[PDB]
């Protein structure tokens, strides 16, 4: 008995450290704080992440996640990672409106709602004066910070929300620099939304400053994440359950109690896994 063509049909741990299981949510939903994932904000450290092949609750408001697969990878292998209130709703947007903004696109039970980890700044009365809040990475680790730019469909929409057509956003740090122009243009409804909204994200070195400047269209961060990278993992797309068990190899079909050289099961694998080819017998 010195080869392997079998899988346990489960998803076990790795270094006795269980997977992060996202349920019906995908990564974006999970990080942005999609309402339909509220049950997995408290996820504390893990080996490898598990999407399902039909995990459709993600970016409930339409538009692009920029460098999604880059952010996917960044989050896959992760040791000890922790959410905190980067720009508190209490004290950070004093002269912009901090609750007027929710949408029919992002609902938690028949009620207009919006992402947990972000907050959609709308104008306060007649003016959206420049904001310019900044965050210092006083945490001694990669702080992951995400935000949104909103792209309304009408020019009237703009006034309604952000007042100023001469609207921009800027994001800046010791590693990131971009000005965002709102591209305002009529579109086919998606989720009753002619408008769109793109989601971006950046990592901030410890010690480093990151600053948001905007005259409009900014979807500011509220909750960010202090994280420590790990390596030697990815994201696996399965339907088979998790169990309370140990292993040193994992695949979408199942786990591999392996000491031995190759496998016939699945090519994408996690950790101390044989190469894919076809390996069953040795007389």
């Amino acid at each position: 008995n010195l080869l392997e063509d079998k899988h346990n049909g489960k998803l076990c741990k790795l270094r006795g450290v269980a997977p992060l299981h996202l349920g019906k949510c995908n990564i974006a939903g999970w990080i942005l704080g999609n309402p339909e994932c509220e049950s997995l904000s408290t996820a504390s450290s893990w080996s490898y992440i598990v999407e399902t092949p039909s995990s459709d609750n993600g970016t409930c408001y339409p538009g692009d996640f920029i460098d999604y697969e880059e952010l996917r990878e960044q989050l896959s292998s992760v040791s000890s990672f922790e959410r905190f209130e980067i720009f508190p709703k209490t004290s950070s947007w004093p002269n912009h409106d901090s609750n007027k903004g929710v949408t029919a696109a992002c609902p938690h039970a028949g009620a207009k709602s919006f992402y947990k980890n972000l907050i959609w700044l709308v104008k306060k009365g007649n003016s959206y004066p420049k904001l310019s809040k900044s965050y210092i990475n006083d945490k001694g680790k990669e702080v992951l910070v995400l935000w949104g730019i909103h792209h309304p469909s009408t020019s009237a929409d703009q006034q309604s929300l952000y007042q100023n057509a001469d609207a921009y956003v800027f994001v800046g740090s010791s590693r990131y620099s971009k000005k965002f122009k709102p591209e305002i243009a009529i579109r086919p409804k998606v989720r009753d939304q002619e408008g769109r909204m793109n989601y971006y994200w950046t990592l901030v070195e410890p010690g480093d400053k990151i600053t948001f400047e905007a005259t409009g269209n900014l979807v500011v961060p509220r909750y960010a994440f202090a994280m420590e990278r790990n390596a030697g993992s990815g994201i696996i797309i399965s339907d088979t359950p998790v169990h309370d068990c140990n292993t040193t190899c994992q695949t979408p079909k199942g786990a591999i109690n392996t000491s031995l050289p190759f496998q016939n099961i699945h090519p994408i694998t996690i950790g101390k896994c044989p190469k894919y080819v076809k390996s069953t017998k040795l007389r």
Partner: antibody
Amino acid sequence: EVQLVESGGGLVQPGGSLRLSCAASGFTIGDFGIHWVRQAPGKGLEWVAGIWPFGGYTYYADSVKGRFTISADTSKNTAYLQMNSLRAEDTAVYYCARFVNWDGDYMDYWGQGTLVTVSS
Amino acid sequence: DIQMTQSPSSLSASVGDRVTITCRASQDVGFYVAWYQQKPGKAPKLLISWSSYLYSGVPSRFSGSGSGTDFTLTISSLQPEDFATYYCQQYYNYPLTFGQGTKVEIKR
């Protein structure tokens, strides 16, 4: 019209005391914050004082610690640099400038300057 | 804290010409840099926000660049009005530091 008209500077006896106001036509005060940058002729600009009103906070440069103090009347649109124990290094053109990020911003508008002269 | 070394300390160049003014920060700031033109006597004026982005005046020839430790302000087609003095500011941290200035002289 954005405005930072600065008034009340002049000659004074060393080891002395002059208040120097920076008032604002057009816009409010608290949501912004004001910086005092002065300019001893020929050197180039040097930042000395800063205030965030809505926040309530103030911070100072090494070189004017404990002497100068920034206040600001919400009722009058104005901010004030109280300059104690003046010197010949403080003889200068003092500028107040408009500012937003208390973590560090740039200068949207400056006033025009006030001249402070302090020796013999 | 931080200091903003300029180069040259003053410059002669005829109209039409590419004036270049470089500025070396003492700490790795990042894009937290502004450029100021100040016509002597009067109060300074903002050219570039955030390292590159032309401020909304009428400054079309003035244009920022750089990153990290060194930033550069170019002037592509110089004028009789660009005689003034030019400073790089930082706002990475306090105390907020400027350079000494660069005095661009017009030849004619």
